[PDB]
Amino acid sequence: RMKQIEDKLEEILSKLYHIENELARIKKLLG
Amino acid sequence: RMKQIEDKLEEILSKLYHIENELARIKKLLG
Amino acid sequence: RMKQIEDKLEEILSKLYHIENELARIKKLLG
Amino acid sequence: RMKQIEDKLEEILSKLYHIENELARIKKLLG
Hints:
The structure is a homotetramer.
Chain A: H1 2-29
Protein name (chains A, B, C, D): General control transcription factor GCN4
Family (chains A, B, C, D): Belongs to the bZIP family. GCN4 subfamily.
Subcellular location (chains A, B, C, D): Nucleus
């Protein structure tokens, strides 16, 4: 339950990693 | 006390899925 | 120590709320 | 698990702060 809990949070922690990658493109796209 | 925990998680999940495509959209909007 | 966890998932939850808005605003501001 | 969960949540906290911060900017540029 708990290891399943900390697993979803490693998940959440990566998508979040992806969104900054993307505000990283946007910035390009916008000068 | 605890189903709540994994219930808010699927929900934090769902959001980031929303955000996912919003950025997709934003990327598109921009190029 | 388990109400702690939840009250954080909520403060995460909420920031995911505002995030949705920044991007729907960014979204309109170009389209 | 206890320390470990609350080693990640506050890494997601921190991260929401900066993705949020990053969007403030996207605003100000965009108008």
